[PDB]
Structures are given as C-alpha cells and as structure tokens.
Design a protein around this nucleic acid. Structure first.
Lengths: 63, 45, 112, 286, 127, 135
RNA sequence: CGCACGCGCGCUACACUGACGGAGCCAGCGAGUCUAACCUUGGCCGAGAGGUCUUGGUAAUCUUGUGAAACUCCGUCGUGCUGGGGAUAGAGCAUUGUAAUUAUUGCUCUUCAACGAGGAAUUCCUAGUAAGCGCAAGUCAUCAGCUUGCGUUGAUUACGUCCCU
C-alpha cells in the first residue's frame, strides 16, 4: 500500500468533482491536523485551478 | 413524671418540640473560646 | 458569498445566476394555515399567507443555512456553502430546508 | 414577597369567626364592620374591637374604609395565614416550618405530620402575589380540583402520589426523597426504562388522559426504602393533560413513537437495545 | 527542619534575605522591612524557660493579631495565642514556619449543614 | 501534499514514558494528557529541533528525543524552566519539579499535610478533607 | 468576603467569520504640580511591573494625533468534552499602602473545569435603532465589572392595535 493514492488521483481528479481533505475520509483513514498543512503543495499536479489566498481563510475552487 | 419528658403539657396547638440530641465529641487542643471547641477533632464516624 | 461562490460558478453556470434562473423563484408559496382559535382544539385552516414563506423556507433557511446551520458545523462557516444553491429549484425533500416543502401544500390540506 | 410572623397574638376570638366568615364571605366578598361578631355569634363588646385591631395589622384582614360599605376581608393572608389556621383546625399542622422548596403556584413546604413521618404542604399562589377575582378563585379550587386529579392511576395499578387536604390554597402531598434524571449518574437496568416511556403513555390512555411534559427534572428515582434502596417512580409529567376529543392528537400520538429517543441513548452515548410500542392498542383496550 | 539544608544556618534569620528569591506578593512583605516586633518577644522569652521544670512545659503567656510572623529559634517555651478570645497554648518549636499566629482560628459554633439543630430554634411555634 | 502512502508504519495511539503519550498528539500536549508538562518546555525545543504543534503526530523518532534526553534525563544541568512549572522551587523540597505523571501528585501536597497539626489551617481540616472529603 | 439550598445580574465558553507571531496604526465627551509630591512624554533598569539615573506641563502645544479597541494582510491548527475557556489553584515578580489578613489589583508560566444556543418565560427595537468594540473616570494607592458619556464599526424586520398588559 504505497502509491495507491497516486493512481487514484491522476485517474480520479476527472472522477472526483472536487479536491479537498474529505476525499480521503471515504477510505476512513485520517481526520486531523494533516489537513491545513496540505493546501500549499497539493496542486503541483496541475489539474484543478486555484483562485484566492487568505491566511485565516485559505480557500480554492474545484474544477 | 418531672424529668422524663420532652415537652410540658401544652398539647391539649403550639410547639413542635425542639429535640436536643446530645452526641458530644472531644475537644483535644488547648485554648477555647465560645466557638472553636466543637470543630477541633471531629471524627465524624 | 465572494469567498465561496466559484464552486457554484462551475456547475452549469457561466455567470453564477444561470442555474439560479429557475432556482430562487420556483419555491413559490401558495398556502399556509393560520393558528385557529378553535376554543380548545387548536386546529388549522386551509388559508393563504402572502407568498413569503416557502421563500423563507428557502431563503431564511439560507440565513441560518449559511451562518447558523454552519454555526458549530463539522466544516467551516462559509465553506459549507458548496451545496446551498446547486439544486434548490424544486422539491428534493432530502435536505435541511426542503424537508418541510411539501408541508405547506399538505399541512393546510390534511385537516382543512 | 412573603410575611409569616403576624399570627400568634390572637385568642379564641378569631377561631369561631373564621370558617363562619369564610363560608360567609362566599355567601356575602367584602364584609362590612359590625358582622365579625354576628356571623360567629361573638358578643358585641366583650373583647371585640381589641381583637379586631389585633387582627388589623396582621394582614389577614384589612380596614377597607369605603363609603358605608366597609371592608373586613377574610390582604393576601386572608387565605394564607387562615389556611395555616385551617390546618391547625383540620388536625394536620401543629406548628409551621421545616420548609425548603420553591415553585410558582406550588411551593414545597417540608412538614412533619400528626403521625410524625414527614409530608409536604405545597402552597398555591399564581401570579408572582397577584391574588384577585379569579386568582383567589383558582387557588381555592385548583387546590380542590388537583385534590381530585392526583388519583388517576393509583387506583389503576400505577404510580401517582396521593393528596390529603385542600385548605384554601394548601395541598398536602409521605414526603418524597426524589432523585430526578438530571441528578442521577448511572443506572443498573437501562433498556427496560426507555421502552417503559412508550408504555407509560400506554398506561395514561387507559385512564383517558394522555400526559406529555417530560424535561430533565421529571422522573424521580425516589426513596421509598432508604437502606436497601427500594426506589420508585415519581412522574412529574402531569400538566400537559389533554382531552383526546380535541384536534391536537395528530401530534400527540406521534410523540409516543419518535420523540423520547434521546435521553437513554445520549445521557444514559450508550446506544440503546430494546423495542418499543405504539398507542394503537390503547385505542380499544381502555 | 527548615529547608533540608543545614540547620545551623537558617533558624536565626530576620526579615531580609531569602525572600529576594521569592515572588512579589510575599516579597513586598518579607524582603522590604526586620519588622522587629519579635525582638522584645525574645526578652520575655528568655525568662519563659528559666523557672520551669525544664525542657517540658512553661507557662501560657497570652498574645492577643492575624498578620504577625513567628521565627523558629525558641525550642522549649509556651505562649498562649489569639484565637478570637482565648489564648491557645503553644509549646513553641520549629514546627511552624512563617505562618500566622492568628491563623489558629475557625471561629464559630459549627456550620449546621449535617445536623441543623440550631436552625430548629429560629422557626415558628405558633398560637 | 506528498501523494505517497506507507506500509503499516503509522499508528494512532502510542504508549510512551510509562503512560499514554499518544501517537495522535505530539510531544507537547500528550505530555499534557499525562499531568505535569506544559507548552514551552517542548516549545523551547523548537529553537533546537523545530517541532511545533501543527501535525497529527504518530511520527516521533526516539533519537530526536535523545537530544531531548540531553534536556531531560538529569534534572540538574539540562535547561529546566524557572518561571514555568506546576510546582517549582517548592516549600516541599526546593527544586523546580518539571516532573511526570507518576511524580506530580507525590510532590504536590506537603503544603496540605501541615498547618493545623501546627494549630492553624491544613493539618486536621485537610485530614478532615481526607477522612470526609475523600470518602 | 466563611457556605446544605434558591434567585437574578452582567461577563463569557460550548469553536474554524474562531483567536495567535508581527506589519496596515484612527477618535472624543478629553484631562494633568501654588505658595508643589499630579499627567506623563530618553534609553534601560528589569523573566515582567514602571522609578518619573530624567525631562515636558496653569494646559488642542509636553502626554496628545489619547499612534484606543473590535481590527486589515504574510505564517498557525479541518471538528478530536477539541491549539475552545482560564474555570479552580501553585511556583518564579511589583506600583503602593506605616503591614496584602478573608490574599487589593498590577505581573511571568503551568493546572484546562462545567457547558454541545441549554425545560419553563421572554428583555428592548425604526432613520439611526439592534449589534459588538474601545477610551478614561467616583471606583484608582489596584483596575471598571455598575455608572454617566463620547468615539470606532454599525444586521433579519415595519406603521399597527389591543390578543398579552
């Protein structure tokens, strides 16, 4: 179980309607503090478009 | 009977009798005012 | 609204009012009871309020539905609004505000 | 607020008077001056205005000097002191006070009986007090009507406490050393007593009076036996009682199915075991 | 026994020095100024060990405050101390360290929450 | 961030320092789950190890803690904070006890053993607070 | 000012519009030593507190532009009686008051409580009223919580009569 998220994102970002941390909860693994960490390195893949930045409210948009 | 009672013959509309149930406990340390005697060494058994 | 609404600007919306063409208005209120005096039995009558209730079953339940139904929510305040105006056109009945949508045309119909 | 300490200065001069004038203020509201002697057969001037000026400060009577329709009225203590005097007269209260308990039209006043075991003088004063045309008419009769409607399941096999006397505002309820469902911590038989909340309104439909009103103060695990803790039920659920003919039972019957589902689950995170029951059986099996 | 460190160092200290290591609500008391009210107390102490059956029990000499601090030096003497009226006999030892002589007080016939018998004396018997 | 998973490695609950310093809370506040260690003890380790509070924390290595054993294991040379602790330079002993789950409550109540055997406040009434308030 | 019970008052916490490390740095009803111990504007003394080792003031100048607060932006944590709260209490610090005791509040850091907008009943509301947030004062030797204000920023719902009274 090493890179099953690597294939089930690059074949499932055009299957999942959004990109968030609640995608990961469908497999029931982690709910916790490894989430606000992961907003600044995720979109180096390059399929979903970022929109806005705010330090208290870091929000982007699904595509 | 003069000393084997709780209430005088006032029954015949008045008192509920005030019961003084004596359950004394010792006063060990030294020096006592009116107050502090009963709260010295209360072994509440 | 401005920090949230680009998600709603994806789902079949060029400008974000285009699905919302047929969404806000189509909850048009037609019928609601009054509290009958009754004399004892507090029954209900088949009468009509002005059409601002199934409006407020869809708009005042978005006032709570944006802030106060996102107050103490699992997710945040403004970003549980990724769903609030997608399919709000007609009766879905499986939601926080659409569950009592049939109950303006049947509550004033059941005991009338 | 309350006064209590204006009573013990009297003599027999008011004891013949009271329930003659209490049945005399009902036959003839506000009584003028020279009638306190002559309703009771008390004499005209043998210790008389001495005794009425004694009663005057005590607020159980007041000098309502109107224009030839004078007033001697048996203020608010004309019910209150004189029902204490009535329980001194009807052989229940022998002195006043070991009392702790607060409501609005039900104060819990902890007393000891003629027997010696305790009971409770609950007092009825609604509107606080506001005692007027119907407020006195209520607390006279809501002490009498609720002397009649606390036995609706005691005869029928279930737990309703028993009333004793109905003196003018006073309703005497043994005394119940309760433990409500906000005071309790744990239980030994949980899943029996959730399905018995469907089943208590089953019992309430046998007598023809459905009761609802259940908050966290309601069901007293009380103290019948102190040592071995043979507890019981006190069910403070009464005043949401509705005659079933009225058109509100569409949402009273559905309360019996899907409204009690929180307290044995959440208060007692422990998700429950048992079954339930409707009241469609109780429509026919009264 | 005063700290655990050497006892021939600590017992005869005044209102000066260690409290400049201690915090300022009990440093704005003990490291400001010695308050020498226990200095003529020694002069009555030096006679309160002479004519006793020695090492055992001297006389209960009275003392009537609530913010006065005793220093441990004086193993073997007795002083009666304020408790609201009377004078609690204390065989003065190093077994009290910087706490009030007038802390010897809980001054009431006790608070009736378990046996409420004096509340029964205020209620109403009634004619 | 990094779309990479692992092979059975990460837990969710640990058992660390004789009690549960967990594998979902860090060094800092799972040493608050056990009683006796506050924030800035392991947050002054941040200027020497750069480990702050921002993670789900079944990640700790027992050799980074060995440079924190350079801060822990002898309580007499190893940067113990001096305006911080639970009980600290005490009337009880005199040292700054930044102790642990098994060593706070045994080093806490020598101010409550004392004063009214000594006739003042805390030597009968706190024993009354153990002969009555403890049962 | 000690606590078997009960009420009300305001203030909060029960969370991700939350507060935190710092930059974006505004008001006024403004108030300050006479025949003196006030308001305070130099770096640091100091873990911190200010002394006013100094200075400026009979006053919109010197505090003062009360460089006020809620605060806006780079970094902090995605629901876990929780990085929510400091509830209770201890240890390392003062400005004092002739001494902080029943600590008088100003000061660094841990202890982190009930409580999942909470049963009954409701408090005030229209062109400037809800709603927060400050300032400084009789409280000040220790601050405002009450208070009278001013200032900052300022929401759903509306011209109506007895249903409550």
């Amino acid at each position: 179980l090493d890179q099953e998220k690597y294939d089930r994102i690059l074949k499932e970002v055009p299957t999942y309607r959004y990109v968030s941390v609640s995608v990961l909860v469908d497999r029931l693994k982690i709910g916790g503090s490894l989430a606000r960490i992961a907003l600044r390195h995720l979109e180096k893949e390059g399929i979903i478009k970022p929109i806005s930045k705010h330090s208290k409210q870091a929000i982007y948009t699904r595509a | 009977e003069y000393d084997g009672l709780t209430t005088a013959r006032y029954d015949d509309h008045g008192f509920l009798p005030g019961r003084e149930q004596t359950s004394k406990k010792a006063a060990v340390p030294k020096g006592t005012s009116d107050y502090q005697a009963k709260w010295y060494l209360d072994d509440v058994i | 609204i401005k920090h949230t609404l680009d998600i709603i600007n994806v789902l079949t919306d060029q400008n974000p009012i285009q699905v919302v063409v047929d969404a806000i208005t189509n909850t048009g209120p037609r019928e609601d009871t009054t509290r009958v005096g009754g004399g004892g039995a507090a029954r209900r009558q088949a009468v009509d309020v002005s059409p601002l209730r199934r409006v407020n079953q869809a708009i005042a339940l978005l006032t709570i539905g944006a802030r106060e139904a996102a107050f103490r929510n699992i997710k945040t305040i403004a970003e549980t609004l990724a769903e609030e105006l997608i399919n709000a056109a007609k009766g879905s009945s499986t939601s926080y505000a659409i569950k009592k949508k049939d109950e303006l045309e049947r509550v004033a119909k059941s005991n009338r | 607020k309350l006064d209590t300490s204006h009573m013990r200065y009297l003599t027999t001069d008011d004891f013949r008077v009271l329930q003659a004038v209490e049945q005399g203020s009902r036959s003839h509201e506000v009584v003028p001056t020279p009638l306190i002697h002559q309703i009771s057969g008390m004499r005209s001037q043998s210790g008389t205005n001495r005794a009425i000026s004694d009663l005057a400060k005590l607020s159980l009577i007041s000098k309502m000097r109107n224009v030839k329709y004078d007033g001697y009225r048996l203020t608010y203590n004309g019910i209150d002191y004189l029902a204490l005097k009535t329980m001194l007269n009807r052989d229940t209260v022998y002195s006043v006070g070991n009392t702790i308990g607060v409501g609005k039209e039900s104060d819990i006043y902890k007393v000891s009986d003629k027997n010696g075991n305790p009971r409770v003088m609950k007092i009825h004063r609604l509107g606080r007090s506001n005692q007027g045309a119907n407020w006195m008419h209520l607390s006279r009769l809501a002490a009498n009507k609720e002397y009649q409607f606390m036995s609706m399941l005691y005869s029928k096999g279930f737990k309703v406490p028993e009333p004793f006397d109905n003196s003018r505002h006073i309703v005497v309820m043994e005394l119940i050393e309760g433990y409500p469902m906000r005071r309790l911590r744990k239980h030994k038989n949980i899943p029996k007593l959730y399905s018995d909340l469907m089943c208590f309104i089953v019992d309430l439909a046998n007598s023809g009076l459905i009761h609802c009103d259940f908050n966290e103060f309601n069901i007293m695990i009380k103290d019948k036996l102190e040592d071995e803790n043979d507890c019981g039920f006190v069910v403070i659920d009464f005043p949401q009682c509705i005659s079933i003919q009225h058109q509100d039972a569409d949402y009273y019957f559905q309360r019996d199915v899907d409204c009690i589902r929180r307290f044995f689950k959440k208060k007692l995170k422990y998700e429950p075991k048992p079954d339930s029951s409707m009241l469609d059986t109780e429509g026919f099996g009264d | 026994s005063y700290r655990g460190v050497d006892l021939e160092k600590l017992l005869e200290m005044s209102t000066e020095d260690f409290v400049k290591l201690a915090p300022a609500r009990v440093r704005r008391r003990f490291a400001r100024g010695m308050t020498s009210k226990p200095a003529g107390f020694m002069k009555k102490l030096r006679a309160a060990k002479l004519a006793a059956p020695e090492n055992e029990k001297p006389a209960p000499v009275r003392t009537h405050m609530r913010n006065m601090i005793i220093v441990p030096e004086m193993i073997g003497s007795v002083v009666g101390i304020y408790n609201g009226k009377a004078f609690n006999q204390v065989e003065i030892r190093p077994e009290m360290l910087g706490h009030y002589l007038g802390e010897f007080s809980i001054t009431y016939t006790p608070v009736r929450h378990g046996r409420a018998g004096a509340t029964t004396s205020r209620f109403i018997p009634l004619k | 961030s990094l779309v990479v998973q692992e092979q059975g490695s990460f837990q969710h609950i640990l058992r660390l320092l004789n009690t549960n310093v967990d594998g979902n809370i860090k060094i800092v506040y799972a040493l608050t789950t056990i009683k006796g260690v506050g924030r800035r003890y392991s947050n002054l380790v941040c200027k020497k190890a750069d480990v702050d509070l921002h993670k789900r924390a079944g990640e700790l290595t027992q050799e980074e803690l060995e440079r924190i054993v350079q801060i822990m294991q002898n309580p007499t040379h190893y940067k113990i904070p001096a305006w911080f602790l639970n009980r600290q330079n005490d009337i009880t002993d005199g040292k700054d006890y930044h102790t642990l789950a098994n060593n706070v409550e045994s080093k806490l109540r020598d101010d409550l053993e004392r004063l009214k055997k000594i006739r003042a406040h805390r030597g009968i009434r706190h024993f009354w607070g153990l002969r009555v308030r403890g049962q």
